[PDB]
Amino acid sequence: MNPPPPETSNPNKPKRQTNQLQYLLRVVLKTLWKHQFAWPFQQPVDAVKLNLPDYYKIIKTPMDMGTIKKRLENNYYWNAQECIQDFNTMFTNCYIYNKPGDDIVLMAEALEKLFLQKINELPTE
Ligand SMILES: CCn1c(=O)cc(SCC(=O)N2CC[NH+](C3CCCCC3)CC2)c2ccccc21
Ligand code: NA
Ligand code: NA
């Protein structure tokens, strides 16, 4: 069974639109989204479809780029660091559940190195 996906809206969470958060959506996420290795990360892990029954036994804080994309579009974040943390959680989950050398890890590594190149310089507020 899959758990409920992470929330993409929360009316009592404080929000704001910063230049950096707009950059994370327009530049950083759109670039990673078009990558050849992006498809496994574009939606929450379906433990039933992918035949990964132990996934949510191991991963207690799931995250994916589809959730991040909706969070950015719905103005869910307070600052860019909250969004960067969601990216880091998505990558760390992949390295926790899988092992070095796996195809999915090679994909995550390629996206993480691209992610670091794009956020090395953010716009100023
Ligand atoms: C980034 C999320 N994610 C994964 O972490 C792993 C995978 S594939 C992991 C995989 O193929 N495994 C990992 C689990 N493994 C066994 C599954 C049965 C329990 C014992 C472990 C079977 C082979 C993945 C695939 C599609 C989309 C997302 C995926
Ligand atoms: Na691991
Ligand atoms: Na940049």
CATH fold-level label? Histone Acetyltransferase, Chain A
What is the annotated CATH architecture? Up-down Bundle
For this structure, the quaternary state is monomer
User: What sort of overall outline do the alpha carbons produce when their principal axes are compared?
Assistant: globular
The description of the largest β-sheet is: none
By helix and strand content, what is the structural category?
mainly alpha
Number of helices: 5
Overall number of domains:
1
> Proportion of β residues?
under 5%
Order of helices and strands: HHHHH
Question: Explain this structure to me?
Answer:
- By secondary structure, this protein is an all-alpha fold.
- It has one domain: Bromodomain-like (Histone Acetyltransferase, Chain A), CATH 1.20.920.10.
- Helix content is 50%, strand content 0%.
- The protein has five helices and no strands.
- α1 (19-33) runs antiparallel to α5 and α4 (80-97) runs antiparallel to α5.
- The radius of gyration is 15 Å and the shape is globular.
- One sodium ion is lined by residues 95-96, 98-99.
- One sodium ion binds next to loops.
